[PDB]
Amino acid sequence: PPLSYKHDTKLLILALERLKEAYSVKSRLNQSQREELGLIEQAYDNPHEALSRIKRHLLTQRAFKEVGIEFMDLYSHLVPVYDVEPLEKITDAYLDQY
């Protein structure tokens, strides 16, 4: 992704909106949810800083923090559910959109 990419902000907005879709109908917020949603708000407030951090992660970051796993108990079979760090989640979401 170029530094002066034209659609750079549209993809970031789409990624942040997709990340926030998990709280659209929420009524109470966990501390982890509070922190993640604050990260999303901060990234929206300063899109260029978030994009710069995303590019830095895409270029240099090769080691990542542990991901938590849980299973949705569908009675026929277990469905894995992975919990990624919110900082890495923004980069992954923007990368997926792009």
Partner: peptide, 14 residues
């Protein structure tokens, strides 16, 4: 672990 209401931006965007 305290529970807090969702920000007003959610209602505004909805």
């Amino acid at each position: 672990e305290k529970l807090t209401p969702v920000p007003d931006s959610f209602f505004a965007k909805h």
